[PDB]
Amino acid sequence: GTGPEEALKIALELLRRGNPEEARRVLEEALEEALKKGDPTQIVMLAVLLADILLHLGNPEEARKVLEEAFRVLLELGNPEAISHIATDLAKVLELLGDPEKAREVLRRALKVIQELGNPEAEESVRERLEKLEKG
Amino acid sequence: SEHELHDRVDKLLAEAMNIEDPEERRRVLEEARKIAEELNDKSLILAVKLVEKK
Ligand SMILES: [Zn+2]
Ligand SMILES: [Zn+2]
């Protein structure tokens, strides 16, 4: 079967070979299962790749929906490093959508859960993202 | 340029997730780490570390 790792490999090739919509559908299906049964690292990398493909396809609101869905799940899985990456990419998409207020909210909520989990590297990571928000 | 560099890291990390040869996997993760530490972006560095641990 095509687990998360196999779907990532197929999608990277299809994207590079000019087939982004087919790369998108491969990851959409894999992410759907990983959100219920996959581990936080599998969720993170499926979601950040799928979201970025959607972003450059010109579907940024779909990119946000993917990152937001993964973000909600990862907030409960106890892995502060996974929370950092997903919140970073979600906040950046929210910025690119013209919604910096929600980008801040996402990062502030990630920071609060990371502080509760206890991981100073993940906390310094999200703090730095909150600082570097002065961009467009 | 920073977003392009972040994308490059994310694609290298996605690739490493399925690589079977351990030395090939290390090299790809080192390519990702190289970019992330050159950017000195803590979130991107931590993104590499998350995948290195797996
Ligand atoms: Zn991108
Ligand atoms: Zn990312």
Domain extent listing, chain A = 4-134
Q: Where do the domains of chain B lie? A: 2-53
Task: Extract the tokens encoding A136.
Answer: 């467009």
B21: left (phi over 0), alpha (psi -120 to 50) or beta: beta
Q: Which two tokens stand for residue A42?
A: 């599998």
The domain A4-134 is placed in CATH, from the list 1.25.40.10, 3.60.20.10, 3.50.50.60, 1.10.760.10, at: 1.25.40.10
> Resolution, in Å, please?
1.9
Candidate from A6, A81, A126 with C-beta closest to B50? A81
A41/B7 CB distance under 8 A:
no
Tell me which chain A residue has its CA closest to the CA of residue B15: A9
SS3 A61: helix
**B18, B43, B53 member nearest A5 (Cβ):** B18
* CA A55/CA B23 separation, integer angstroms: 32
PDB experimental method:
X-ray
User: Do residue B47 and residue A85 have CB atoms under 8 angstroms apart?
Assistant: yes
Window 13-52 of B: residues touching A by CB (8 A cutoff) are 13-15, 17-18, 41-43, 45-47, 49-51
* A44 interface with B at CB cutoff 8 Å: yes
Ligand 1 centroid–CA A52 distance in Å is 5
Neighbours of A33 (CB within 10 A): 16
Encoding tokens for residue B50? 């998350």
Distance between CA atoms of B40 and B35, rounded to whole angstroms? 9
Query: For residues A116, A118, A124 and A126, what is the CA-based torsion angle, rounded to 10 degrees?
Result: -40
> What's the CA gap between B16 and A131, in Å, rounded?
30
Q: Does A124 touch chain B (CB under 8 A)?
A: yes
- Of A53, A124, A126, nearest to A93 by C-alpha is A53
Beta strands in A56-116 (DSSP E): none
CB contact (8 A) between residue A45 and residue B41:
no
Residue A99 is which amino acid? D
